Design a protein around this ligand. Sequence first.
Ligand SMILES: [Zn+2]
Ligand SMILES: [Zn+2]
Ligand SMILES: [Zn+2]
Ligand SMILES: [Zn+2]
Ligand SMILES: [Zn+2]
Ligand SMILES: [Zn+2]
Lengths: 158, 140, 447, 447, 73, 73, 73
Amino acid sequence: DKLNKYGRPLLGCTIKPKLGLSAKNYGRAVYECLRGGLDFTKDDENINSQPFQRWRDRFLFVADAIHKAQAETGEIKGHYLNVTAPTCEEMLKRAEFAKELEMPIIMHDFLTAGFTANTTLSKWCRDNGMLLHIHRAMHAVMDRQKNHGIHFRVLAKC
Amino acid sequence: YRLTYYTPDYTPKDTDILAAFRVTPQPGVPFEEAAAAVAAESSTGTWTTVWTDLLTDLDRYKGCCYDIEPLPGEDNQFIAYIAYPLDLFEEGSVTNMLTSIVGNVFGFKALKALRLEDLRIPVAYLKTFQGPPHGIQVER
Amino acid sequence: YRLTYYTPDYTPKDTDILAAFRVTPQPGVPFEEAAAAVAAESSTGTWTTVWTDLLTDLDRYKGCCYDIEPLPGEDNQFIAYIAYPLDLFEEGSVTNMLTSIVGNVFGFKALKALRLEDLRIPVAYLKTFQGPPHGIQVERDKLNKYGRPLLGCTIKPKLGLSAKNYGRAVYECLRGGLDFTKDDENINSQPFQRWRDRFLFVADAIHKAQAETGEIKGHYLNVTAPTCEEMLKRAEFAKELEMPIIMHDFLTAGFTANTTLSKWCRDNGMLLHIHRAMHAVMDRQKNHGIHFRVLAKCLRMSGGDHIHTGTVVGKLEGDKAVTLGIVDLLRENYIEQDRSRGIYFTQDWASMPGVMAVASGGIHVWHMPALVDIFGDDAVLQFGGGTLGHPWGNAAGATANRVALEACIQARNEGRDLMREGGDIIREAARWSPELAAACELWKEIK
Amino acid sequence: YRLTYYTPDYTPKDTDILAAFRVTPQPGVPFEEAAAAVAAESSTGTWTTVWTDLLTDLDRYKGCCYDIEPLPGEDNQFIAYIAYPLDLFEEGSVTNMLTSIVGNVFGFKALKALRLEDLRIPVAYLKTFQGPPHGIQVERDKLNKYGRPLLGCTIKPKLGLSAKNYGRAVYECLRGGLDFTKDDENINSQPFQRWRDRFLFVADAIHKAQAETGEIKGHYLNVTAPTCEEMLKRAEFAKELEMPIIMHDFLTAGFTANTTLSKWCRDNGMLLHIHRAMHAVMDRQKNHGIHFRVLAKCLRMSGGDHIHTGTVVGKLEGDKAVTLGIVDLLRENYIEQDRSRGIYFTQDWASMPGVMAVASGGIHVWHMPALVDIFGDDAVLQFGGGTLGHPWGNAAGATANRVALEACIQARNEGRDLMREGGDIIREAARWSPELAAACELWKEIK
Amino acid sequence: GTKPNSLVCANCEGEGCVACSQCKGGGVNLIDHFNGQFKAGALCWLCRGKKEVLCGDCNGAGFIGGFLSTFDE
Amino acid sequence: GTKPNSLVCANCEGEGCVACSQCKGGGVNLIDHFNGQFKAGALCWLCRGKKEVLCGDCNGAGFIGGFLSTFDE
Amino acid sequence: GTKPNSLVCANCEGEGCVACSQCKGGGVNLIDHFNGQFKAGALCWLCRGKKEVLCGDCNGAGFIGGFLSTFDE
Ligand SMILES: [Zn+2]
Ligand SMILES: [Zn+2]
Ligand SMILES: [Zn+2]
Ligand SMILES: [Zn+2]
Ligand SMILES: [Zn+2]
Ligand SMILES: [Zn+2]
């Protein structure tokens, strides 16, 4: 309903491996992928905020890419902006700036950040009308080996 | 073919993050290839310059295996010693360090198993972390 | 008596902070005694182990002179290189770095004079600072201006104008083709012009000039203030008006106030231009004070997106080379040690972003080809009289400056020598630009 | 050519800000041109009406040299007296005042050197400033201490100690007889000692020492920080522990940060000790920079309850009289113009409260009579080695200093001459005090 | 995917690209395509003169087993 | 810039402007400047009747050494 | 304070401490002191057995002109 997309799966593209690009060059890639007909794009899970690319700059140019692509196609576009962060404070600070740029969706690494962080962000997303794309980095540490650990179906339930 | 992600001539910088992975590769997979792939998979995901050429600073943000060390037993294990540059990681975020280093490789199908035995956390990266609230001395 | 604070076999650690002092000791004092005591005075305050022995870790948090280097003109001076361990300094604090190193030694009565020429900021310490809120790359993407230096204009001397009349001058320079205008550093908030009125009318000027030209404009609104609360309240209102850029006086306000604003600018996507009023009180005299290159490093660490570097037109030799060491020190990630340009230490910046160099002073259209050749793209050229003195007014002065710049950029890309064909390049453009032709009458070509 | 910016007829208005510059011009340049250029460069930037004519109120907001005074020393050195109108400056901002006056002129190429010796701060501008948070009178009331100077001790060099060990040293000095202890200026928050831990143990030392002696105790807790946020967070925690006093480094932190902290101190009832780290960078050299008396005036305006003035024991003639000129300028409400004490202008403070003068450095029990006579009651005597060096420990050293002070106060009340009978005063008290007797064997009497 | 006793991509042999099948390395159309929407002699319809395209089997990785070449889980 | 044993601007004698060289102080054109776009007799093409233009050596300061005339640093 | 053509403290020769003048190196009292308050043969009244005390001219710095050994300003 929020996206107005029915009777089909949605298409996405991970902008990967393009680690070390400028926020603007990263945002030119996002623009092209959406303009050409995909519904979503996705942040590299490794990208949070780093010397090569700070989060606020990435969020700004990604937002340009969506508005421009949404305009030219007439279809709702989105990009899972990665708010995974060192602290809950920093995570929500990022989520808020996504909400401030009118972005429909964000992403979060639930295992490396944790379930206390993720539940915080899940409630925030309910409160703010934000869609939440959950990435599962580090899952194979627990769920690969068939005799020890936690199967993914449990971590999917959780 | 020359493996650019296995450089045994490389001497780690003091700013590099170093990992020691106990790799259990699939039978038939040589140790050198396994180690270069573990380097790529915890990093750019590639050995080549195809995707990298379409970037600005190129393979600057890559991991590489600088040393291989076979281990006792008939499980065909070795230690892949791998170096990552300081710029890859968000300052003060354990979350991002684990995300970058252990995010994908543990599900790499060219291995049977894989274990992170140790990390050399460099001093420049440690200065971006608070560390313990107080610690031994202050607690006492 | 062995001097424990002069340790010439010590190899500096990569984590140490290294200082290079130009020491002018009292006549009769040997260089080694002076070097030891400068290490002691910038540190514990003692050579001995009397106070030290009363402590737990002892002489661990001490400076030590690890090298002496005499100079031609040699009764006077030497350079003492001193190393301090990383533990001495609070993380992310230029304030405490300066207090610890330069807090007392300058008043050391066994010296006639003393000057800190350079610091080596170690990578591990640099990672505790934010650095510039944006820096060169990130700025250019925010402004959408590439392949050329940016052009600016100080509205000065126009002290005493209405905020609206000031705004009118701002509009005209920007509309005429400059990228930026600048607040008078003396203008914060006064009876003749209150700050909130200036911000309003400068904003109208920006929106209007940007709308008509289709190019992003900015004005370095001065948020320098009596208090941190007032500094931020002024920054916030610039943000409320959707201003791309503000300015701050980092010395007269101070590093504690500046680091605060640097953080706030990162947090709110605001470009930060740094003015350096009062620098000459410290950096002018060649035997005493702190060289500007140290202040420039401190500012890069504290945070600024632009900074005034010193302006040079000549043959890049001697004191002109000093200025370009500073420029490299501000913009590059890795600057090799090079004594002919005053770079005493190799400085790794470890991806802390570079700062735009601001060339300012009495510049004009004839200086354009030289400036483009010397500074390259990552610079801001601030015109004073060179824009405002144009006899058809402010917009026409700007148009002349913009036309001169684009002519130099096209010639550079063609392969031409900007230095020796600079006169030809301007005159060729002045055939096709009445505004440039008028500028070329007021100001005289340089040999 | 008539020089409009040199007007020897001009009588300063009582609202003008007046500066006294010791100008060392380039040889050949006549004094009147130099005087007029300094007046312009610290102001509009021009002699002419060219830029002026393109404004509303024209040359109203200009400085002008109103007097020249050649000096005998060296020749090519004169005092230019310059007047600036009240409308130039922002209300309550030392930052803007310094920016306006000293922002550019020190870089002026037609001079070799330049020094700002004094400023006349007008009564009408002073009332825009808070001034000290408390000052002399109000401080003595909070502490309940009268008829004597205050004794203090700098916990230095003890860099590397635990919060707890550092606090044990504070406990002993306070318990032994001192009123105050002082943080090492180099200690803010470091790996070896984090600020919150220090503040806690210092608070334990105070409450305990205060409980045992029955006299109010204080320790100047260093809130100097990277950011205003961190500065105030530390000040807030000192308030939370019910500490009566904190310290701040005003030059390395900056005036903008310092004016914020001074306002916070007034609002929360906190005494504010101002340390002056790095001052020598500007105030050492006699021909270039800013004399401390200007920085001391600025600090009284921005605000502080204690400030370091320099320490003197001798005949109060020449360089020693300059030091007492500064003391009067910080303490008194009205200071008569007096060139023999470096007081270039009469200064009316308009009831802005006075600041306690801190005498520091290598002082010891034998200096006590001299220090009482020269500085009087409204002063803090900060001991370094003079307390901590005592062979029986910190408490005994503190006792030796207190007994020496109490001796001098009683001698003073009896009509004795503290200057010629100082040695006798101390030796007499040494009969009764074994701690003082022990101190008198370490340090030597002055002739 | 892989070569024998190896994890290198057999199709490109660790290069990440292959020669363009359409123009056979020439960089030009040998025949017309799509009823002459792309004409013979002009820049190759597929590669546009670059004479190589991405290897599909490894998606430029040069090896098989990783996220870029293999399915999830 | 300066006169002998002085800091006053030599080009303008401390006045900050000079006589306009195109109209020669009269405030009127003398030649058909630029193809008679600014024709002779009328308003000066350069100064536009103001008979004076900014001094190029000091940019209106009337003296050399200061920020308005000299390079930074 | 300083030695000839030098900045090392003359009183201690840069050690920052001197011999205790009361016990004269011995560490024990020779005469009574303070009207029999500290007896002969007991621990030294000044140095308490340590045999050295801080050098008063430099306050343990070893050198003259620094903050530890000099008046402020
Ligand atoms: Zn392949
Ligand atoms: Zn092809
Ligand atoms: Zn002139
Ligand atoms: Zn004319
Ligand atoms: Zn000594
Ligand atoms: Zn003894």
